[PDB]
Amino acid sequence: SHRKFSAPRHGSLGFLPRKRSSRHRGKVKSFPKDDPSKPVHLTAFLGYKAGMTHIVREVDRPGSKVNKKEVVEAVTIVETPPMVVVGIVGYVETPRGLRTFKTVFAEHISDECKRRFYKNWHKSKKKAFTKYCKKWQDDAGKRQLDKDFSSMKKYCQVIRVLAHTQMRLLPLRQKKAHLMEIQVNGGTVAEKLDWARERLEQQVPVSQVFGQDEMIDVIGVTKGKGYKGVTSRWHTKKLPRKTHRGLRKVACIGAWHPARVAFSVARAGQKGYHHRTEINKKIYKIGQGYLIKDGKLIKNNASTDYDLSDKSINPLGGFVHYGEVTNDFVMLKGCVVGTKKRVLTLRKSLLVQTKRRALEKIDLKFIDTTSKFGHGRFQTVEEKKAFMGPLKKD
Amino acid sequence: VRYSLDPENPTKSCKSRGSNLRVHFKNTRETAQAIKGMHIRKATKYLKDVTLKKQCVPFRRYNGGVGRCAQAKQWGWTQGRWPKKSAEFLLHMLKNAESNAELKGLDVDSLVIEHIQVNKAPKMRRRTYRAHGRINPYMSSPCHIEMILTEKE
RNA sequence: AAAUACCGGCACGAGACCGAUAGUCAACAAGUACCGUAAGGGAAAGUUGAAAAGAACUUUGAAGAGAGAGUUCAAGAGGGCG
RNA sequence: GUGCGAAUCGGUCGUCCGACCUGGGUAUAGGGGCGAAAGACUAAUCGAACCAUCUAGUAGCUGGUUCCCUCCAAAGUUUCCC
RNA sequence: UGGUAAGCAGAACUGGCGCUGCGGGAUGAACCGAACGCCGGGUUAAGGCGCCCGAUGCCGACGCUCAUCAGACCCCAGAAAA
RNA sequence: CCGCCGCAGGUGCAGAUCUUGGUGGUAGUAGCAAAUAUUCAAACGAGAACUUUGAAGGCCGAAGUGGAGAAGGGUUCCAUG
RNA sequence: CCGACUUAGAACUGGUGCGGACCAGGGGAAUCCGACUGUUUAAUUAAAACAAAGCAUCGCGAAGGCCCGCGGCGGGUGUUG
RNA sequence: CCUACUAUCCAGCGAAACCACAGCCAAGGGAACGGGCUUGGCGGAAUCAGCGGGGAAAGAAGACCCUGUUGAGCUUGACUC
RNA sequence: CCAAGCGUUGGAUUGUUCACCCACUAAUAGGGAACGUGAGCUGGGUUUAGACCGUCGUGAGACAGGUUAGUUUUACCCUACU
RNA sequence: CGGCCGGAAAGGGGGCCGCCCUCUCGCCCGUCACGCACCGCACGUUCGUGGGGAACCUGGCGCUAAACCAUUCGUAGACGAC
Asked: Per the record's keyword annotation, is Ubl conjugation included, yes or no (chain A)?
């Protein structure tokens, strides 16, 4: 007989295969649609979830009840030191889909990239690209390298650039950098391949890829939570306390005589560590990294137009379970996927960006730099000392 | 007595045998298959590592509910264990077989374990006491082991 | 008295019977072991070899267990063993 | 709930100077006992204990009913019948 | 014959199934053809002959029909008035 | 021990939730989760998470996990191996 | 001069915390049933069932009433009235 | 969300229920609800933790209902004592 | 009419399916899947054994007549699913 | 035999002029006759120095890795895995 009272179905069948993501780094399934009118640009970047803090800005949307009033928005700090372009891959467009035509790597590949090509770097003689490197410093090799670029600006249609993260500049434990094909979307294939060859062994900073007040799609792996029951994994109703064999499960798991159990029925298993693409994540500000000019360091990142402190987005006692953000970061509105330190594939929108909310320009009043490691009271170190006076440790 | 398989030439071969040994048959069949073709010295260091849980025995046939260890991948298998008592019993039997080559004038550190065989022995009967005044058997599954070393450069 | 009866008893002889899941419950330390408060219930269990000649001595092991050697027509019979 | 257990375990309960609890001794025995009565209890057995025998009880009702080939080959209808 | 009907209940005649394989009906106890020792060749029945699948791969004959729910072979497995 | 001619029968098994005995798959699986808790060093010894000694930390907490008995057991007592 | 357990009252005091653990009644307004305590289907029913005091019938003056027993100058009530 | 014991993995030890053969579906027909047949989907070793859809899962020769010229306990205005 | 994409609620009383009412709501449509779904629960109702009542029966007892109390066993196999 | 000039959807055996170059043979008729003419007879004739797997010889041109375990981490985790 029928469902007595109609309730909607618990959980989506969209992401049905609720398994450990086979990749740790978020694959870009779809790059933006290129038009040969535009100038050349990278369409994706590769960041690291440092942490999460407040903002204070004045909202500017007419008609709302928060028009010309201050808000407090949650923001993430994605530390994004500039990525080193170390290769270019061409793709021929075929009736069986889209085939990789030819890869050309750079001459000098940094040991950050080399580490990626080994499971046991310690045990290895580090021979990767030692016979390939020899193609760039003989006449007989340069010839056949330039005939690969010539062959690729003829047949290939989708040019992607290989860029690895600069892992040495981060506070993380690891050194094995993250390689990534980033699609170059721009003019004609010829212009696109002359440009990527020009960028071969170059830093690509994040201001060259992204800009402020830009809606971007964040791709990563979800924070993993292990083997979970149906009440945790699917958020089904908890059964009555008097249940004999357990109140933390789905009671009916099928009708009789569709005499299997359906893929749609909610079972226990792997929660979290699922690959996810969150769209419409706004860039509140792209931050300048720590740099030295005229002897003194510059760290005035959280210095807004109305604050003018000399405090960084590094909170008191650093970002918890991360480290200090000494490099150029992109500050995204709201929470994004994955845990702290999680490699976090940024991507320009797949979607034509035309709203009041999407075209909004963001003028920050106050970035909160209070301690995240407990109920932080003070923004900077000198404020804590100015208020509390001299301690016994002075 | 009478062994199942005969060696190529009895000259370059020594034997050992254990009747009605009180190790599990299944655990010992698996650790006797792992050692089945190895060199006597490669065999001892393997069984000493099984004892220390550094190298595993891949449970290939008798693998019902048997857990998955990382060490099993050395055997191109997913399931493996460290049968300590089974290792130790056919490590006493390598001790004995080595002792017989020594006696026959054979060179020890050229010996390869060619034939090894774990037969089921007569079971020993004990009982367990179960709900509603019932008695069920709690029988041991002991095993006959008999193996033949052979000289191979 | 005799002729008649006699699945107990003491002896015997015999068989187109049974051949160790058969024939008595019992071929054997069987009305035993064991079970039940008791009345009662009630098993399983034959076979080394012609002869113990039942494997000295050596060897590895703490040992059970082996490897040799030896007995024997045979251990392809090694003490619950045709 | 193939248990610790052929009735147990935990919390929570009822009663705790009295128609109180309790050990030993003693009496009542099977269409009998005993019953502040539930067909309760009478040795894990109770709307008639258990044991042996009568007994291989009877069964129009279930189940099974052991080699081969060769030939012939049905009936489920009539009449009477607790 | 009863029943609104029923793969319902009850009769008459004959043939089946049960007791019976075999070709055909995709698949069926009963429909259709045809009843059977073990084989070779030949030929048919009922059914078929795009491919599954043996056989139209004939220069088959004449029409009829377009369905945004086509139609497509006894029993037989799905429709009427309009 | 068997062929032939006769004689005789406790004379042919796949079934009986058959009888008795044996053995599988289940399966190296369920399991070895009631009553707070062990640790360090040494000794004996082929061998020690478990034995013994010492030291620590705990528990029963006199309605005891204490010291004695009655029923019942029948040598379980005690030493040595 | 020997005092041995309490009781009441006051001051001060702590971050209003104090029967600090432990021990240790939720309460009220009503209906139904059985007065109550007691008892009961050991192993699914603790109940409103049974019992109970109170009440009321009935039998019988012993050669008797009630009852037992195969039996008897038998036996229980009955060491009774 | 936290805690204790599990489950979990390992060393050692190690049962049982169950079991024609077995084990992917859809429709068909069929003893009128197939794991096997037909016609289609299709189909890749060996496995671990889970789980309760199915095996018309196991458990026990339906306690219901009917039949039997099968009973029993009980009742009485049944019959015969 | 094309149309099952997406919704179709919170409660009082009742074991209830059903009904009825309150209130919210875009709307508070109707159904199937062994009258989906008890090794998923629950056990309120029916539906054992204890008891009370009414009617019925001489009685034992009967009552889709009320009432109260009443053991919800197993997955570790194969598949399916995760 | 040295180069010129061609070839991405799953890149190929091509076509050109120049020479070091060897013949005036090949193709079509007609001459000269010869070659196991194996005595009537079957898997003959190809692709084919085929595909795959072992080693035996030999001359150039050369190549000096990694994975897994163990340890470690905790962005992961029942165990593997990550």
From this structure: yes
